[PDB]
UniProtKB/TrEMBL annotation:
This is Beta-lactamase domain protein. InterPro entries: Metallo-B-lactamas, Mito_Persulfide_Diox, POD-like_MBL-fold, Rhodanese-like_dom, Rhodanese-like_dom_sf, RibonucZ/Hydroxyglut_hydro. The modification Cysteine persulfide is found at residue 307. GO terms for molecular function: metal ion binding; sulfur dioxygenase activity. It comes from Paraburkholderia phytofirmans (strain DSM 17436 / LMG 22146 / PsJN).
Length: 349
């Protein structure tokens, strides 16, 4: 049927992560995942009801540590990268012409070295979009001064693998520092200041040799970590983290261990003595008074906020975590889900 496509951006390394999936089979693939964003990217795969077949990595990154290894152990995905990168511990190595499939859709590998000798470009099956990585950026190119990088090879790879793509084809890069999101083949072929227009191989290399950039900060860490594919958490209840950021607690576990946590009920006083009941041992502290009543809460006990549907209780976690509570968890669905799952309620109807 349709393609499902999402662009995520890592503020700390300016990295674009790309999530593709086929709505027919709900099977997905995730391009250039970032280490610090693993709980975030996996949350979004669950809220979309997807299944991550592969994490693909266009090249060994110097700016950021990849999330391929962490995601392979969390949700089961498979570390793909090019064979030319040199990285150890991938489930599938990749070569020019490899068809990576997910559902009825697929991507196509194109070797585009120059940034590194392992850089690849993932073209979409219908060739409406492609993921160049660090080979070709928006009105620019990746740097050619480290990681076996050569500006002659980048120019040959852009004019021969990327500029041969259809004119209207969108080009999604792995980074951008100006707040831009996409560019087409026709734009760069014409307006790229480094190697578009009428520039020749000798015009590009004189631009790069005289482009002097500051090193990335995580270079001494990312490169050895990404050479091993990214190899170098709340343990007081079974906890997940919604894409929205809020931590949620397993209700079934909570029913079994009501004595362990400090259940806090943030509804109005009416609602607590009201028709929906209340979890046994709940503690009425209304949301509009929990700002300046935080001093009434034990540090030696995790806190689990509850409300009607679980919205005002999520806001209670942001309030408790700004007050310095390290163990806090919303109960998803609130009493409406609690009651509709048969769980024990006092003073109901
Ligand atoms: Cl609510
Ligand atoms: Fe790079």
């Amino acid at each position: 049927h349709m393609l499902i496509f999402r662009q995520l951006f890592d503020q700390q390394s300016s990295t674009y992560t790309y999530l593709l999936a086929d709505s027919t089979t709900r099977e997905a693939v995730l391009i250039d995942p970032v280490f610090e964003q693993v709980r975030r990217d996996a949350a979004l795969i669950e809220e979309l009801g997807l299944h991550l077949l592969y994490t693909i990595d266009t090249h060994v990154h110097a700016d950021h540590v990849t999330g391929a290894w962490m995601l392979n152990r969390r949700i089961g995905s498979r570390i793909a990268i090019s064979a030319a990168s040199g990285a150890e511990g991938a489930d599938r190595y990749l070569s020019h012409g490899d068809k990576v499939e997910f559902g009825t859709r697929y991507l196509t590998v194109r070797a585009t070295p120059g940034h590194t000798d392992g850089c690849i470009t993932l073209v979409l099956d219908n060739e409406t979009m492609a993921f160049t990585g660090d080979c070709l950026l928006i009105r620019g190119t990746g740097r050619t001064d480290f990681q076996r990088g050569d500006a002659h090879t980048m120019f040959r790879a852009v004019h021969g693998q990327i500029f041969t793509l259809p004119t209207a084809c969108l080009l999604y890069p792995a980074h951008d520092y100006r707040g831009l999101t996409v560019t087409s083949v026709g734009e760069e072929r014409r307006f790229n200041p480094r190697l578009g227009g009428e520039l020749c191989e000798e015009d590009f290399t004189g631009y790069m040799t005289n482009l002097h950039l500051p090193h990335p900060k995580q270079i001494d860490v990312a490169v050895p970590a990404n050479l091993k594919c990214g190899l170098a958490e709340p343990d007081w209840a079974p906890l997940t983290c919604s894409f929205a950021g809020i931590w949620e607690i397993n209700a079934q576990w909570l029913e079994e261990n009501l004595r362990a946590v400090e259940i806090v009920d943030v509804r109005e006083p009416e609602e607590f003595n009201g028709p929906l009941g209340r979890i046994p041992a709940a503690r009425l502290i209304s949301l509009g008074e929990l700002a300046g009543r935080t001093a009434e809460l034990t540090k030696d006990r995790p806190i689990v906020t509850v409300s009607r549907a679980g919205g005002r209780s999520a806001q209670a976690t942001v309030m408790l975590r700004q007050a310095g509570f390290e163990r806090v968890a919303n109960l998803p669905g609130g009493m409406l889900r609690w009651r509709a799952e048969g769980r024990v309620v006092e003073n109901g109807s």
